[PDB]
Ligand binder design. Structure first.
Ligand code: BEF
Ligand SMILES: [Mg+2]
Length: 1012
């Protein structure tokens, strides 16, 4: 069945072989059940943990980590000549972290689910259908409906499946379709076929799409689509079809990892070339066959030194902290890398209905006829501060609180609003909020009546359940209803006749018809005949409310004090309805709209300050979208919007060259399909701009998937929350601004500690390369490198993750996504730092070799040929040979590396500001982590079993002073580099004296002037 709206009810019923009066038989029900399937949308399949683990390998950082670990284990198996099993420890310690963060990668996701599925109303859709088994209607489950079923729908009932209308039992049928198309006002439905086959969902006025609900009437229909074949099913399929790429942070990390792998390959090739041809010496090896093992050991040590193992752990820690901060700020984050995406966001695309506005119609402005004379009059204007269905609020007359009990005309206005309508407002604790039960306008009138207590009813000690209708009931008892003249299309108004416990008849409708059908006006408590001037005045008020700066739905109200009695009523004719109120007393009019949320305008201003562009993409009409844009501040009140607001049809006809500056300039998009929303998001992404698509409902589900980051309102549909990466549980729109702020700060911290880790890794690489080239014995075994790069390089990195945010963070435009984390000059600076670190470590080892008070004196680089001396040959000196395996040089190099890393973390507090201007105690976490890691290093040195796992030994006072003497100049070098970067306090210096002056006490020539 296709294009059911284009076909009349007769052939639609004939196609399925179903009768409207009887329905479907059980055999037909089961045949259609097996032919089509279950009438439900399939849930997301449970991603097994094994698949998640195997797909976590896709990141290039963990890719290089895993390949390095695998090669290390392979060469651990290669080194079968050793006996102690502790060697096989050195690869294993890697694998643990490769799991740890991975678990967190799953764990947080699970937490997100625990916060996403919790914000769902798990009430099965319970649908009334007609079948041949029983004449009366029967209530069945949602999944039991099959195409061809006859469904009776009523007010307040959610539509179970796509239903073509057959006949409306009531007068008119109103359907709220804000879920599917973002329409802010209910749509009237009819059984007339729609000739256009390619009509949009809003053009189809003879269809009841799934997910929507009925507002006013009751109707009968025939199901034409179920499950996936429905409009929501097609939209969900389109959302699943679209592919979400990696986050910009993930892309930057992947590029960084590719560069790092290229560096590893280049350095390994270079060291192999510089080390090949060294087998010509009369040593063992079997033509480099047995020297290949030593060369590969050097290569794997270099690869380990070049890969920061603790980087993923600190990255995950920072992302988890940001996610926790959003959890505190009522924002659920699905994926850890997505918390930074808002920081680099340039354009924010937002839905109007339900996202920018509360989707709850409310009255904001009302006027009563105050003072009238011949041809001129003065009107009393009022303003309502309520934005939602909650009955809390105050009425303001010329910007001051006012009680409506003093105004009689306000009393009649409240009476008409409370009595003429037929809907109501209720409060529930499952969601803990207020909902409507009928038309949005009627419940808006009810909320307006409740807000203005004309009868001064007590409310300070009343429960929230009866708060929704606290004073509406008070109005109802005193003036009891008799009957209702329903709404008529030609009349554009509807009336209620009622009698007291005299006998007035209220009428509410469009301003023009109501004011044309009235022959009296109400001034306070007095009746005044027709005079023109008041008529033009009130008509001007009507159109300045309708088409002014704020677009409002004007609703004229009148009362007939002398209507015809009950007995002379003919309710069977709609034509007779109009003539029953030929003489009316116009009381007043009210203005209602779907108001934007109170936190939108300030958030829009803040986003404009941060350089972020805000665009409205909605399915509603252009006028309402432009009005909301003007209200929230996207456009000015008098600003022209000729080339800044577009419709889907207008955008389609636009040339791609015109579409270029349309996307770069236009800020309002109205009447767009979900495919059009995804097309707009893709076009914006085609200009290298990070897109934050915030919204709710089904119509935003594909776009939420297409954008770089998708944000879903907590009151939105389940599909929208599934397609999004962030969820606003409390529906606070400033949370987006807060998330952007922390994302910028988090990216700054990322840059800081990635640069610190790269400095440490290049230092280790230079140390190993210099040791290999110089021929000296190894100064750093790989397990020490793992211990350093995890503990001593994660605790300072975690502390750097707590860097204080910049003051000018939110007053600058978003960063260019194409820029790299490490610039050329910063790369040179950190390369120099690493070269100094490696030179310092090698120099400490050589200093222990050649000039040590408690060590040997094999100096002038003689006998430094490692793996060469075996006995007392002439090149062999007086000292022994086993001293080359002493752990003293190893622990000296380790201590120098640790101290230099402490200094590098100390002066990496700022990108360019000197450590003198910014004292290190600004970040107490930094000094805390430095002290903790130094304490752990001391514990490693002075504990029983670890100094055996690590080939180290405790030092003495002189060696420690030498270590600090070597380590401190890195602070001066970094300060000089920062100074030359900037150009091209007292309390800190006071603490410098007890340290640097102590260094001046002892001076040593170092006895090292042979080569370097
Ligand atoms: F729901 Be949006 F306003 F189209
Ligand atoms: Mg919406």
């Amino acid at each position: 069945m296709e294009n059911a709206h284009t076909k009349t009810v007769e052939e639609v019923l004939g196609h399925f072989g179903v009768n409207e009066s009887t329905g479907l038989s059980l055999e037909q029900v089961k045949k259609l059940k097996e032919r089509w399937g279950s009438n439900e949308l399939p849930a997301e399949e449970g991603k097994t943990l094994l698949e998640l683990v195997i797909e976590q390998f896709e990141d290039l950082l963990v890719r290089i980590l895993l390949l390095a670990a695998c090669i290390s284990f392979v060469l651990a198996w290669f080194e079968e000549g050793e006996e102690t099993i502790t060697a096989f420890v050195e690869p294993f310690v890697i694998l643990l972290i490769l799991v740890a963060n991975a678990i967190v990668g799953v764990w947080q996701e699970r937490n997100a689910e625990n916060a996403i599925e919790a914000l769902k109303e798990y009430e099965p859709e319970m649908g009334k259908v007609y079948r041949q088994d029983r004449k009366s209607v029967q209530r069945i489950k949602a999944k039991d409906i099959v195409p061809g079923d006859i469904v009776e729908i009523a007010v307040g009932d959610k539509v179970p499946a796509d239903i073509r209308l057959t006949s409306i039992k009531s007068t008119t049928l109103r359907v709220d379709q804000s879920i599917l198309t973002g329409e802010s006002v209910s749509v009237i439905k009819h059984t007339d076929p729609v000739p256009d086959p390619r009509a949009v969902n809003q053009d189809k006025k003879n269809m009841l799409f799934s997910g929507t609900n009925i507002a006013a009437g009751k109707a009968m229909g025939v199901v034409v689509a179920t499950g996936v074949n429905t409009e929501i099913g097609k939209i969900r399929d389109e959302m699943v079809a679209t592919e979400q790429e990696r986050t910009p942070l993930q892309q930057k990390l992947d590029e960084f990892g590719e560069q790092l792998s290229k560096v590893i390959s280049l350095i390994c090739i270079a060291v192999w070339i510089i080390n090949i041809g060294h087998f010509n010496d009369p040593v063992h090896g079997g033509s480099w066959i047995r020297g290949a093992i030593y060369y590969f050991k050097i290569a794997v040590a270099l690869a380990v030194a070049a890969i920061p193992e603790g980087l993923p752990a600190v990255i995950t820690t920072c992302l988890a902290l940001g996610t926790r901060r959003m959890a505190k700020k009522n924002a659920i984050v699905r994926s850890l890398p997505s918390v930074e995406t808002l920081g680099c966001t340039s354009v924010i695309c937002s839905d109007k209905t339900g996202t920018l506005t509360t989707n709850q119609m409310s009255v904001c402005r009302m006027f009563i006829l105050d003072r009238v004379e011949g041809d001129t009059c003065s009107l009393n204007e009022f303003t309502i501060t309520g934005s939602t269905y909650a009955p809390i609020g105050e009425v303001h007359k010329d910007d001051k609180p006012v009680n409506c009990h003093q105004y009689d005309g306000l009393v009649e206005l409240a009476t008409i609003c409370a009595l003429c309508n037929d809907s109501a407002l209720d409060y529930n604790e499952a969601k803990g909020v207020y909902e409507k039960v009928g038309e949005a306008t009627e419940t808006a009138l009810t909320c307006l009546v409740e807000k203005m207590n004309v009868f001064d009813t007590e409310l300070k000690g009343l429960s929230k359940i009866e708060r929704a209708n606290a004073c509406n009931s008070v109005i109802k008892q005193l003036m009891k209803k008799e009957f209702t003249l329903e709404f008529s299309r030609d009349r554009k108004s509807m009336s209620v006749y009622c009698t007291p416990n005299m006998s007035k008849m209220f009428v509410k409708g469009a301003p023009e018809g109501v004011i044309d059908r009235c022959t009296h006006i109400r001034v306070g408590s007095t009746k005044v005949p027709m005079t023109s001037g008041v008529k033009q005045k009130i008509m001007s008020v009507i159109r300045e409310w309708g088409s002014g700066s704020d677009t409002l739905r004007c609703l004229a109200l009148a009362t007939h004090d002398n209507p015809l009695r009950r007995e002379e009523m003919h309710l069977e004719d709609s034509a007779n309805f109009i003539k029953y109120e030929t003489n009316l007393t116009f009381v007043g009019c009210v203005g209602m709209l779907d108001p934007p949320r109170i936190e939108v305008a300030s958030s829009v201003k803040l986003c404009r300050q941060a350089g972020i562009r805000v665009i409205m993409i909605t399915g509603d009409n252009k006028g309402t979208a432009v009005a909301i844009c003007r209200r929230i501040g996207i456009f000015g009140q008098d600003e022209d919007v000729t080339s800044k607001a577009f419709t889907g049809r207008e955008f389609d006809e636009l040339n791609p060259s015109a579409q270029r500056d349309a996307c770069l300039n236009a800020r309002c998009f109205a009447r767009v399909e979900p495919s059009h929303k995804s097309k707009i998001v893709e076009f914006l992404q085609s200009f290298d701009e990070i897109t934050a698509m915030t919204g709710d409902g089904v119509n935003d589900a594909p776009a939420l998937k297409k954008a770089e980051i998708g944000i879903a309102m907590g009151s939105g549909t389940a599909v929208a929350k599934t397609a999004s990466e962030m969820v606003l549980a409390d529906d606070n729109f400033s949370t987006i601004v807060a998330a952007v702020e922390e994302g910028r700060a988090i990216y700054n911290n990322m840059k800081q500690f990635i640069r610190y880790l790269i400095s440490s890794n290049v230092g280790e690489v230079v140390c190993i390369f210099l040791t290999a080239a110089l021929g000296f014995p190894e100064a750093l075994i790989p397990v020490q490198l793992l211990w350093v790069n995890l503990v001593t390089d994660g605790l300072p990195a975690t502390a750097l993750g707590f860097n204080p945010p910049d003051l000018d963070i939110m007053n600058k435009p978003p960063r260019n996504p194409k820029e790299p984390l490490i610039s050329g000059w910063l790369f040179f600076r950190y390369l120099a730092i690493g070269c100094y670190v490696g030179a310092a470590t090698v120099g400490a080892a050589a200093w222990w070799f050649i000039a040590a008070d408690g060590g040997p004196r094999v100096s002038f680089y003689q006998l430094s040929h490692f793996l060469q001396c075996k006995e007392d040959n002439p090149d062999f000196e007086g000292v022994d040979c086993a001293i080359f395996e002493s752990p003293y040089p190893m622990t000296m190099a380790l201590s120098v590396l640790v101290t230099i890393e402490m200094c590098n973390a100390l002066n990496s507090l700022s990108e360019n500001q000197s450590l003198l201007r910014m004292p290190p105690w600004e970040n107490i976490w930094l000094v805390g982590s430095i002290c903790l890691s130094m304490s752990l290093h001391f514990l490693i040195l002075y504990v029983e079993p670890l100094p055996l796992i690590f080939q180290i030994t405790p030092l003495n006072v002189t060696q420690w002073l030498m270590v600090l003497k070597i380590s401190l100049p890195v602070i001066l070098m970094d300060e000089t580099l920062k100074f030359v970067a900037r150009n091209y306090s007292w309390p800190f210096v006071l603490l410098i004296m007890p340290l640097v002056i102590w260094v001046y006490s002892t001076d040593t020539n170092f006895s090292d002037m042979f080569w370097s």
